[PDB]
Amino acid sequence: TTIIGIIYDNGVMLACDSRTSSGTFISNKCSRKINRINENLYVCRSGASAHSQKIIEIIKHYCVSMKNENRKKGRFHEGETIYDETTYDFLSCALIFGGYDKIKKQQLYAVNLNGSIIEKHDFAVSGSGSIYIQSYLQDKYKKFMTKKECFNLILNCVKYAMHNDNSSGGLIRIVNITKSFVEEFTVVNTQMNFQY
Amino acid sequence: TTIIGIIYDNGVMLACDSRTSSGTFISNKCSRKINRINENLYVCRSGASAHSQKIIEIIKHYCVSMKNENRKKGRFHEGETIYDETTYDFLSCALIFGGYDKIKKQQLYAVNLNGSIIEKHDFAVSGSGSIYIQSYLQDKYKKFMTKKECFNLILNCVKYAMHNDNSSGGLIRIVNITKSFVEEFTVVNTQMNFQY
Amino acid sequence: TTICGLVCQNAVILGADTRATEGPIVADKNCSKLHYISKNIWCAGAGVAGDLEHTTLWLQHNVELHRLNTNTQPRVSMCVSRLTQELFKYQGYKVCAIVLGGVDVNGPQLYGIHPHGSSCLLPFTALGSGSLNAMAVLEAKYRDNMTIEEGKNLVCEAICAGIFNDLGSGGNVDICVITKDSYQHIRPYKEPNMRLYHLPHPTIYPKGTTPILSEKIEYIKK
Amino acid sequence: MDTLIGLRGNNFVVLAADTYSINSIIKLKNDDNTKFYDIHGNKCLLLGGSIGDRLQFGEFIRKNVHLYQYQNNTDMFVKSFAFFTRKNLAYYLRRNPFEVNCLIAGYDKKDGYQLYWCDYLSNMDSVNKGAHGYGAYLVSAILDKYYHENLTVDEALDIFKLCFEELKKRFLLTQINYELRIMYDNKVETQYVTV
Amino acid sequence: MDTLIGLRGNNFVVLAADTYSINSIIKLKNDDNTKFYDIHGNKCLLLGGSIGDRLQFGEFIRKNVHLYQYQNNTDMFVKSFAFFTRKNLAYYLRRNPFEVNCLIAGYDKKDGYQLYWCDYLSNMDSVNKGAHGYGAYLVSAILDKYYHENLTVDEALDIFKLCFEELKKRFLLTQINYELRIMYDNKVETQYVTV
Amino acid sequence: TTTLAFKFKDGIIVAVDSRASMGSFISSQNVEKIIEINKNILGTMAGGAADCLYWEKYLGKIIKIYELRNNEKISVRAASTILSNILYQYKGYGLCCGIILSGYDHTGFNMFYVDDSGKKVEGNLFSCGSGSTYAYSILDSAYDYNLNLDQAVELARNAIYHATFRDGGSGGKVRVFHIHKNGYDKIIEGEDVFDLHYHYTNPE
Amino acid sequence: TLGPVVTGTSVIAIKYKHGIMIAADRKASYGSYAKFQNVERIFKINNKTVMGFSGELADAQYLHELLTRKNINNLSEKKRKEDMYTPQHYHSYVSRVFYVRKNRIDPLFNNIIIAGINSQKYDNNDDNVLLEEYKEIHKDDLYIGFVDMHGTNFCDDYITTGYARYFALTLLRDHYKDNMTEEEARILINECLRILYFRDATSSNFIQIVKVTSKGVEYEEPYI
Amino acid sequence: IYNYNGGCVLGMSGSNCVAIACDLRLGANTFTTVSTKFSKIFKMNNNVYVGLSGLATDIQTLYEILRYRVNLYEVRQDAEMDVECFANMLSSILYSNRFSPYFVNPIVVGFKLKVNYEPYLTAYDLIGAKCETRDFVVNGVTSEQLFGMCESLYVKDQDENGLFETISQCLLSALDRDCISGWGAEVLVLTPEKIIKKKLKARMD
Amino acid sequence: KRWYPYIDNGGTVIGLTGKDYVILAADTRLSLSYSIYTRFCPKISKLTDKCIIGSSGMQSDIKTLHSLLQKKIQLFVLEHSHYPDIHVIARLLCVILYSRRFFPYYAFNILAGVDENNKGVLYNYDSVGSYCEATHSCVGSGSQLILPILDNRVEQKNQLIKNTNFNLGDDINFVKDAITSATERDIYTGDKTLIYVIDKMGINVNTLDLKQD
């Protein structure tokens, strides 16, 4: 599968395909490779769905225990992401975090299959089809984009990473994140059609 | 290594990096991954340089025996490329052909590690760093380009395939092919410098 | 072991084949692959029957214990969570692809759990060794908001297409509607054998050898 | 290996074994070895296999039975003793290997002279004759040809003399010395013979 | 395995071997086997190892030497015969395995009574005493303690009687029968003894 | 697969069983384990089913060629050495055989035993197969070399019965041949021997 | 060769009253990604017989060159229209070359499907290697063979290979009728290929519908 | 399940009576026989018979475990254990040792006792897969030579005298076809009023 | 990946005899390890007017072995001007398999037919060539399920040896019942069956359709 996380001028976007095949067979067609943890942060998982679905069930357990720990509207993202590293002390699954916060404006992190929590202030991409669109991102990624400029970029990045990869999803689930917690799941169903 | 073959409106261009490492060590720095067979066609090899350097020594032996077979200025390209498949009947090395002809205007072929000689009338890309720039090519490849339009595309494709790959070459060797047999080796030494 | 299931406008219809084989030889021509979890949800699984029969019994009682603790009907989102936390502890041994679904407080869901621990909601799915044959005809005639009668023949055709086009899948086909009021457990499409019937030959009375017979008349407890 | 011949009559049980200790397989360390683990309650057990595992198991099964015969004023039944040692082999199979073969044999005042048979695993079964080791393929056939019903001790020893001479002639490691355990009329005597 | 004892005196050569054929390792197929491949020119060769390879090599080395002894009116020298069979083992080592051990022994009118020794590979070397098989670890020490210089036949057979009784007492497969090849004063006689 | 051989005061008595199994299943119960070669030499196939049946018939091609070129009856020693030499070429190829050749040559009643790798051993009381050791031990108590044919064929049946009883690989119909001085007689099948019963219960 | 590195998709060959209908996609996957997306897989070897690939693609050209030379060799002695090599003869040749490779180690991984008109009752005694209405065939003169990599050869009315043997074949064993019309044939193959596009990783669009009618061999390129 | 200590069991269900048969071979090695009196059927209750088949180190062990649990349940209830509760008990005992399995292929033959009487025949596997069969059921090493064998010699409902001949010929024709089993036969046909321990003079080959 | 060149395509062949007739029945299902390729692949191919042959191994070593045997049988009919008996065909077929002993023909075959006026003979062997004259045989995936059934009618184990008469009218119905039992229990056994009866006047190609499970 593919996962793309781009950062806006105010928020952050996350999108992924929905294929998750299992041995050249589509057994989990049109699934949810992205996940919801709170009103502000989402986690899009990749890799094997066996050992990765347990991590989202653990993160959801710790985040609700951490959001109730502080106060009623006390949430955190960076602190919650480094806790995912502790759950990698064997299972292998790369994750891409990302959300809005109050200490800073937006944030995004990338957790590899071994435990690195190297954050990325610009953008991030991961998954199986991530290799085919790594240079296309760095060429079209500007410093600050708009809500419609970045949306047109991820709409082409997932479509390009699917056209030349056997783990091509069907409908893609693009998720936005802002200050006012818009968090609208802009899900589309556009296929790829080359011209020449 | 990386190899990119784009087709002009009249000719065809070929370019490749010059790194060819051997076990995370640069033992053959600034080499010639591209090769000359005749005045009209060039062959850019990839993969392991052990079993691939013998194929170029064989192709050069058959092409000079085939060009002397017909007459003085009797050369051929498609016929010479399918002979490379017969030399894959074990060694593994992917090759990318390409040149000018008289039966048609230009031509380009792609020989994989097993023996497929699937030609490509649009463009072709192969090698180790080819995976990182497959979508960037299909997005920027038009139908007919110019001598300067395509040159600016391969200058960025090899530079993008080197910046995000450990088999990053130094100087790249871009080779042009036309009707009048220009065949000038436009070799540059431009490094990659991102902006954001 | 063709097991498929799909959702409808108000219920979830499942279906399976009554045939369990040892691999080269069938064990019985009638094996109920559909299990009873509770009144509002049913399950069915493939793979090894041992790691599936106990997993259902472990789930049929853990749900009933949780149902008796509260006073509401058990939700389908609870049994899948207990299976996920249990299959990861035995990921290399408890190999059983289980599919289950039924009505709850939400719409009629249908969860498909793979033996490695993953699970995902699906509008219609197939499972087992004859899953490809069942999912083929299932993806062809899958409309939306179909009635129970329009979903009855589709799940029946999905199994029947998985019987003829497969080797380890035969026998009768049984479905189970999991509507809000109660369940159903029918055995349609018996497929009668109109070929040359078996003619059993009862052997004559004096036969065998019998070197010694230890005849014992014991009527102590009725 | 080591031959463990065991023949059970109608009123007696005769056990035969090898008196060769094979440590450092090329040579014989000591002759006239001790394989029989005589139990105080007329139950002559006979083990076979590696010397390291026959000593760690014959001693453990003897003190565990002598404890039961002392914790209670009674003696252990041969049927209970045969299944007690079978349980210890199955228990000590998952942790330790215990490559041993035992021939349980004794006498009870309610079931007559019994004789059991085991294997590497726990394969207890009451038989009238049996054998163990690599020499079992050459002695299990002689016992079948000469197992006339209602036997006697003087005729059973004739079978073993017709059996020991067979192992000395057509067996790989020709055994010459043997040790018998006649159990006729509550008198367990050790009549070790040669050739 | 099979013991191949070979003792060379100052005017004689005595070879000893096993008369047990071990096919289907559990049992002995036939007693009083034929291991010695007597050559017409006073060169009693003695092989050892698998029965399949000792017959395919003892016959081939006998006809190849009998051909040389017939193509020329002379007889083969024991030094030339010992190195001829050594060359055939090294030649038939890369293609076929030939797990055989030979004890070359004969007599020449220019070098006295000689005796050689080989191995699985080609390890020819002239010695005064030697042994083969698994029983070599129990007989190579007796020959060293009793190798008084300028021996005689009547004292060398006493060494073997002091050697055969050792294999019958502290060896794995106790061999009882043996076959001797005394070569005293151009008279090769077969004195097979037991126990 | 239990085979026999006797070499009594009269000719050699060869006796076999008729079972041919493949692992844990019996293929057939009517296999012919006695393969004749000439009017006097008759082999005994064992071990592999056709890994030795082909060479037993291939020997018949080589012997019949020599039987006419020299117009003299070949010996058992020559028939054994020929079969042992052609079998040694297929040593490390995957064969599995056991063959007991027996007949009547110009010098007494010869008898040999050929293995897979050519282990030609000459003797008087051979046997081979899966249940060989059981039948090998019954003969040590009754083979006296001076037994008449009446009590001789009974020993062949008594030895095979005790071999097919303890072993599971062998069994089926029991064949017992008797090599005469100018041919060989026959006995076909027993299939059920009760040498120790009165139809009471099961033995042990 | 050794290892199916350039794996291809599967074809679907059905027959009707006007002729054979073989269709496939032009996508050849290299490992785990669609490297080539414009490579044909329905190769013509005669003016009346065609053949389809599956599995390895690089090995497939070796078998195509072996069969196209036999066509020119057979055309060299065409002194009558009945001397042409029927599709049954081509099927027995491919089944023979697969069995010879089966005895050795190299098996030449493929799932070759040979289809064509097994008759010569139609005027075609003028062959052109390089460059009105249809007819009705008796259903017995329309040979469609299959050849597995192990050398398994047979023939049916409809032959489905590769991954579509589990998806399109089940949908085809109950909907296929005898002597279907031309429009009903492609409305069934396009419907069965749609299922293969949703439940297979190494599959895509760019269908290459090839029909072998009684007047020649055609080509098309729909997009579903 | 192993070739070591071969053997097989089979259970047939008549009209109102049921029959269970088994061989008596204690195979030492794979192709060896050291005992002809190894009954693989056990009297677990007054009307609930069990038949174990497989390795002998687990047949005697599982019988001692079941006897320890049935006797602990019969005296605690002061009534005999039925078949339905006993059949599901074996499905949990075998599953409780899923990591270290008991190499046995059991069978359960016994009247359900609904005053009434029912056949209730069922078998299991190495891990404990329940398989309810209202007709004949078989498990063991000779499972391949008995499924098709009983499929051609089985009637719907048979009497007491007819069930024994239908099960004796079903076992004797399959035990002579297998090599690692079949040194005897001991069919235990039982009616709701009496049981019959009839032995068979099988082919001792 | 090592490319195991042996696969079992399923299918069973049943064989019976009598006094002047042999019956060779076989299902016609050619299948892969788990899927079904087709429902018609005749495993029985005739050779002469009084001899046929059935097989049940892989379909590669069946069309080759039948054509290789038919090529040699078509050479012998013209070099000797006489049709071969079954007693001489079995010897020719015993040496064909041994010619490829190291790479065996993975196909267990059955030879049926009559040579004299009556003389119903049958021949069955393994995958290498140990032919033995039997009176009843079954080969294939259902070789272990049908063989004990045919061992009750031909051979006996009963006390009273009944069924002294075995006519062709009843013997055909038994093979139709035996092949039906293979489909209901074995998985690889097919649906269409070709009952081949070889009497003293030729062969018959009677058909039967079983369960398409």
3-class secondary structure per residue, chain A: CEEEEEECCCCEEEEECCCCCCCCCCCCCCCCCEEECCCCEEEEECCCHHHHHHHHHHHHHHHHHHHHHHCCCCCCCHHHHHHHHHCCCCCCCCEECCEECCCCCEECEEECCCCCCCECCCEEEEECCCHHHHHHHHHHCCCCCCHHHHHHHHHHHHHHHHHCCCCCCCCEEEEEECCCCCCCEEEECCCCCCCC
CA distances from E39 to B24, E36, E78, E119, F87 (A): 67, 9, 11, 20, 26
The alpha-carbon gap from F30 to the nearest alpha carbon of chain H, in Å, equals 13
- Nearest alpha-carbon partner for E117 in E104, E99, E107: E104
What does the DSSP assignment read for G185-213? HHHHHHHHHHHHHHS-SS--S-B--EEEE
Contact E46, E35 (CB under 8 A): yes
The beta strands (E) that lie in D57-187 are given as 105-108, 112-115, 129-130, 178-183
- Per this entry, what is the length of chain F? 204
Structural domain total, chain E:
1
Q: What resolution does the deposited structure have, in angstroms?
A: 3.6
> Which structure tokens are listed for F175?
């064949």
Amino acid at A186: T
Against chain F, the chains showing at least 3 CB pairs within 8 Å are C, D, E, H, I
Is C119 in the A-facing interface, judged by CB distances under 8 Å? yes
What is residue C82's three-state secondary structure?
helix
Contact I30, I129 (CB under 8 A): no
* Dihedral (CA of I102, I103, I106, I107) sign: negative
Closest CB to H148: pick one of I146, I152, I157.
Answer: I146
Residues contacting residue F175 through CB under 8 Å, at least 6 positions apart: F15, F16, F17, F18, F32, F33, F34, F186, F187, F188, F189
What does the DSSP assignment read for F169-193? SS-S--EEEEEETTEEE--------
Cα F178 to Cα F154: distance, rounded to the nearest angstrom: 12
- Measured in Å, how far apart are chain E's first and last C-alpha atoms? 18
Q: Which CATH class is domain H1-205?
A: alpha beta
Q: Which CATH class is domain G1-224?
A: alpha beta
- Nearest alpha-carbon partner for D7 in D129, D139, D91, D151: D129
| Residue F91 DSSP code | G
Cα H133 to Cα H144: distance, rounded to the nearest angstrom: 17
Q: Which residues pair with A2 in a beta bridge?
A: A127
| Residue C186 DSSP code | B
Chain G positions touching B113 (Cβ under 8 A) are 5
Compute chain B's Rg from CA coordinates: 16
The alpha-carbon gap from D115 to the nearest alpha carbon of chain F, in Å, equals 12
Structural domain containing residue E45: 1-195
- Cβ neighbours around F178 below 10 Å, total: 21
| Residue H95 DSSP code | G
Cα A78 to Cα A84: distance, rounded to the nearest angstrom: 10
Cα H163 to Cα H12: distance, rounded to the nearest angstrom: 8
Phi, psi of G199 (to 5 degrees): -120, 35
Please, which experimental method was used?
cryo-EM
Cα C150 to Cα I188: distance, rounded to the nearest angstrom: 34
| Helical packing angle, B49-70 and B78-86, nearest 10° | 130
Is C153 in the I-facing interface, judged by CB distances under 8 Å? no
Cα D42 to Cα D186: distance, rounded to the nearest angstrom: 7
Amino acid at H20: I
C–F touching, 3+ CB–CB pairs within 8 Å? yes
CA distances from A15 to A35, B46, B193, I30, I88 (A): 11, 35, 28, 48, 76
Contact B3, B87 (CB under 8 A): no
What does the DSSP assignment read for chain B? -EEEEEE-SSSEEEEE-----SSSS-SS-S---EEE-SSSBEEEE-S-HHHHHHHHHHHHHHHHHHHHHH-TT---SHHHHHHHHHTT------EE--EE-SSSSEE-BEE-SS----B-SSEEEEESTTGGGHHHHHHH--SS--HHHHHHHHHHHHHHHHHTSTT--SSEEEEEE-SS----EEEE-PPP----
Cα A175 to Cα A183: distance, rounded to the nearest angstrom: 6
Domain ranges in chain G are 1-224
Q: Best residue in A20, A166, A168, A191 to probe G by mutation, most G CBs within 10 Å?
A: A166
CA distances from H39 to H20, H105, H122, H197, I136 (A): 12, 15, 19, 11, 33
> Which structure tokens are listed for C98?
């289980």
Chain H positions touching C207 (Cβ under 8 A) are 165, 168-169
- Nearest alpha-carbon partner for G8 in G200, G172, G147: G200
Strand order in the sheet with D13-18: D129-130, D5-8, D13-18, D178-183, D188-191
Chain D positions touching H64 (Cβ under 8 A) are 87
The beta strands (E) that lie in C11-145 are given as 12-17, 20-21, 26-28, 34-36, 41-45, 98-102, 109-113, 119-121, 124-127
Amino acid at D96: N
Chain F positions touching C212 (Cβ under 8 A) are 200-201
Cα G27 to Cα G8: distance, rounded to the nearest angstrom: 7
Q: Tell me how far the alpha carbon of residue C20 is from its chain's centroid.
A: 11
D174 with E173: Cβ contact below 8 A:
yes
* Contacts with D, F 123-182, CB within 8 Å: 133-138, 140-141, 158, 162-163, 165-166
Against chain B, the chains showing at least 3 CB pairs within 8 Å are A, G
Cα B121 to Cα B22: distance, rounded to the nearest angstrom: 33
| Helical packing angle, H160-175 and I143-153, nearest 10° | 120
Which uninterrupted H or E stretch holds D156?
helix D153-167
Residues contacting residue C52 through CB under 8 Å, at least 6 positions apart: C45, C46, C96, C98
Q: What is the widest separation between alpha-carbon atoms in chain A? A: 57
> Which structure tokens are listed for E37?
């491949």
Structural domain total, chain I:
1
CA distances from G51 to B101, E154, G110 (A): 31, 90, 12
Domain ranges in chain C are 1-222
The alpha-carbon gap from G41 to the nearest alpha carbon of chain I, in Å, equals 22
Closest CB to H26: pick one of D93, D123, D136.
Answer: D123
Contact A33, A3 (CB under 8 A): yes
Domain ranges in chain B are 1-196
Identify the closest residue of chain A to B153 by CA–CA distance: A139
Structural domain containing residue F47: 1-204
Amino acid at D147: Y
Task: Quickly tell me which residue has 């030339």 as its tokens.
Answer: E80
What does the DSSP assignment read for F95-138? --EEEEEE---SSS--EEEEETT---EE-SS---STTHHHHHHH
* Dihedral (CA of H185, H190, H196, H197) sign: positive
Chain B positions touching A164 (Cβ under 8 A) are 134-135, 138
Chain H positions touching C49 (Cβ under 8 A) are 125, 129-131
Structural domain total, chain F:
1
| Residue I83 DSSP code | P
Q: Best residue in F133, F167, F202 to probe H by mutation, most H CBs within 10 Å?
A: F202
F–B touching, 3+ CB–CB pairs within 8 Å? no
Cα H199 to Cα A100: distance, rounded to the nearest angstrom: 82
- Nearest alpha-carbon partner for A139 in B14, B151, B133, B166: B133
CATH 3.60.20.10 fits C1-222, yes or no: yes
Amino acid at H141: V
What is residue D87's three-state secondary structure?
helix
Range B1-196: architecture per CATH: 4-Layer Sandwich (3.60)
Contact E75, E41 (CB under 8 A): yes
Closest CB to C204: pick one of I160, I176, I186.
Answer: I160
* Contacts with G, A 9-48, CB within 8 Å: 19, 21, 24-26, 29
F1 classed as catalytic: yes
Identify the closest residue of chain C to H91 by CA–CA distance: C54
Is H61 in the D-facing interface, judged by CB distances under 8 Å? yes
Which uninterrupted H or E stretch holds F21?
strand F20-21
What burial class does residue F53 get, using C-beta atoms within 10 Å of its C-beta: 0-12 exposed, 13-18 middle, 19+ buried? buried
> Which structure tokens are listed for H156?
């719907």
Is D54 in the H-facing interface, judged by CB distances under 8 Å? no
β-strand pairing of C12-17 with C3-7: antiparallel
Cα H22 to Cα H6: distance, rounded to the nearest angstrom: 11
Closest CB to F202: pick one of H34, H37, H141.
Answer: H37
Q: Best residue in F121, F125, F136 to probe E by mutation, most E CBs within 10 Å?
A: F121
- Nearest alpha-carbon partner for H150 in H159, H138, H139, H158: H138
Chain C positions touching A31 (Cβ under 8 A) are 120
Which uninterrupted H or E stretch holds I44?
strand I44-48
Cα H142 to Cα H134: distance, rounded to the nearest angstrom: 21
Cα I76 to Cα I53: distance, rounded to the nearest angstrom: 17
Indicate which CATH number applies to the domain containing D1: 3.60.20.10
Mark residue C145 as left, alpha or beta (left: phi above 0; alpha: psi -120 to 50; beta: remaining).
left
Contact I168, I21 (CB under 8 A): yes
I137 with F28: Cβ contact below 8 A:
yes
Cα D139 to Cα D137: distance, rounded to the nearest angstrom: 6
C205 with H161: Cβ contact below 8 A:
yes
Cα I58 to Cα I44: distance, rounded to the nearest angstrom: 14
What is residue I162's three-state secondary structure?
coil
A53 with C117: Cβ contact below 8 A:
yes
Q: What is the widest separation between alpha-carbon atoms in chain E? A: 49
Amino acid at G14: I
Phi, psi of H189 (to 5 degrees): -85, 130
Q: Which residues pair with D112 in a beta bridge?
A: D108
Chain D positions touching F160 (Cβ under 8 A) are none
Task: Quickly tell me which residue has 């001789």 as its tokens.
Answer: F152
Compute the half-sphere exposure of residue G167: CA atoms within 13 Å on the CB side of its CA: 27
Closest CB to G166: pick one of I9, I35, I41.
Answer: I35
